[PDB]
């Protein structure tokens, strides 16, 4: 007899309520105020051109059929009330497979302020699509987007807006930084109108500025390719008469160079254009191949030392240093 007062209020709101109609269907345009709390920015798969994000997708609108007078103002209600009322059909434009978490109860809440203001948050993991242009691999930077808007309601019915200021309407938690390869720099939001065959919809887009950390590929591709060149350029310091010895240098360095040429592109997609790493590999391929034809030159020609070996001892280490000085200068800036 002390909790039946709140039982009367909840049945009073849903009596005569039609949840198939947006509020102000014949009067106004339903403004949906939205803000995103990112609990953990998950990993970026650069093979699928996708990324995973865990959000607290908050929404807010005003319904004039849910006014009430009671003891308390905020009604921190349960989850199953939300399916009994009107909710906007917000979907992600570039989502691929997003999951609403259901353990143990569904991870949604619903607060009904006594003037008719609703707050409807949910916990979603979103596997959105991030189109990439890997022409500066691995020193590239990306702007991974996240576009969302209504599905069945046009811009004359449902419009979207941010709750707080657009600078601080997408908040990233400090502890959630599940990127292991990329590095999150900042977030930028925007809003516009899209055009479709059915009509004009309001779309909300939040870009994620990412920058790849080079340090994995230094100790995986760059340093072993550099040390292969030094392994290939030690052949100029031997004698001219070590034909089986120098041909081990001339074959095993170029045989191990094409293995790293294959194995550096396995995690990459099958893109048509050549990446910036492949230009470093091909010049390093060209430096270890010109060392092999250097030995084939001196083998064709009391045996004194050669002018070819006395010049390639100085030129080939120097000319690799000129390339390495200009490659890291023009792709790190």
């Amino acid at each position, epitope marked *: 007899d002390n909790t039946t007062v709140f039982t009367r209020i909840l049945d009073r709101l849903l009596d005569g309520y039609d949840n198939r109609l947006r509020p102000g269907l014949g009067e106004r345009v339903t403004e949906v105020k939205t803000d995103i709390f990112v609990t953990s920015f998950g990993p970026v798969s650069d093979h699928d051109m996708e990324y995973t994000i865990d959000v607290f997708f908050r929404q807010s609108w*005003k319904d004039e059929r849910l006014k009430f007078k009671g003891p308390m103002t905020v009604l921190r209600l349960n989850n199953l009330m939300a399916s009994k009322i009107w909710t906007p059909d917000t979907f992600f434009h570039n989502g691929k497979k997003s999951v609403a978490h259901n353990m143990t109860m569904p991870n949604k809440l619903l607060r009904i302020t006594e*003037d008719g*203001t609703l707050l409807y948050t949910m916990r979603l993991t979103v596997r959105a699509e991030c189109p990439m242009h890997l022409e500066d691999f691995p020193m590239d930077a990306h702007a991974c987007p996240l576009k969302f808007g209504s599905y069945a309601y046009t811009r004359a019915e449902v*419009v979207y*807006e*941010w709750t707080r*200021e*657009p*600078a601080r309407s997408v908040v990233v938690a400090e502890d959630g930084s599940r990127l292991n390869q990329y590095d999150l720099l900042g977030q*930028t*939001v*925007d*809003s*516009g109108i899209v055009q479709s065959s059915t009509g004009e919809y309001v779309v909300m887009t939040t870009h994620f500025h990412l920058k790849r950390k080079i340090g994995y590929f230094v100790i995986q591709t760059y340093l072993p390719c550099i040390m292969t060149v030094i392994l290939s350029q030690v052949s100029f310091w031997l004698n001219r008469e070590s034909v089986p010895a120098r041909t081990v240098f001339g074959v095993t360095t170029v045989l191990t160079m094409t293995t790293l040429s294959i194995s550096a592109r396995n995690s990459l997609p099958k893109v048509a254009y050549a990446t910036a790493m492949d230009w470093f590999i091909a010049v390093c391929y060209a430096f270890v191949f010109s060392a092999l034809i250097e030995f084939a030159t001196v083998n064709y020609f009391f045996n004194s030392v050669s002018k070819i070996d006395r010049l390639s001892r100085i030129a080939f280490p120097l000319l690799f240093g000129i390339f390495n000085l200009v490659y890291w200068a023009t792709y790190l800036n």
Partner: antibody
Amino acid sequence: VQLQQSGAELVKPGASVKLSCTASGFNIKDTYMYWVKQRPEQGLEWIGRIDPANGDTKYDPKFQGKATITTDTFSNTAYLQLSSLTSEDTAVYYCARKGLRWAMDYWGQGTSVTVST
Amino acid sequence: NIVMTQSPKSMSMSVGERVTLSCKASEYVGTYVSWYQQKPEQSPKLLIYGASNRYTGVPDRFTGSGSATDFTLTIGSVQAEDLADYHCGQSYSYPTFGAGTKLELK
């Protein structure tokens, strides 16, 4: 719809002044309240903002500790509070609300303060 | 903080030709850039909310252009009722304003 402000006043330097912005046709709890400083022959200057749902307040870094805003939902009016006013701040104060795309669609008529002898 | 630079300070053209206002931001503001006019000794009104999105009531000769940094306000034909200075505000952060841009008629 219609935004109303009180009339102009004459104050001495170093005193305190109260200025009001009455809103009609719409409640304050769902839209922000913006106040902006308009000097003569000069551009605008935003000074602060109000979220009346929770009483949140954020000021301009220049006007920190200079102005204070209280808001009454029942009176449908927001209030200025200029504690330490000097003779340099002789201008007109305008009232505003948040528009469709965070613009300021509806503006008050403006109240001019005059700090002189 | 965000600063908005409105160029030029003033101009003077006759009735019924092309005028191009300018407003450039310090850093990235996406679309939330507002245009306000100020008729002398009245209240400001709103011309374009957002970038390139006309408000209701103003004529169709007013138009805008949006980008990441630079924003242009264009009137196809200057009329006799446009004696005001135009202010360029922003709303991606806490709002700031430019210095305005006066105009005069012969």
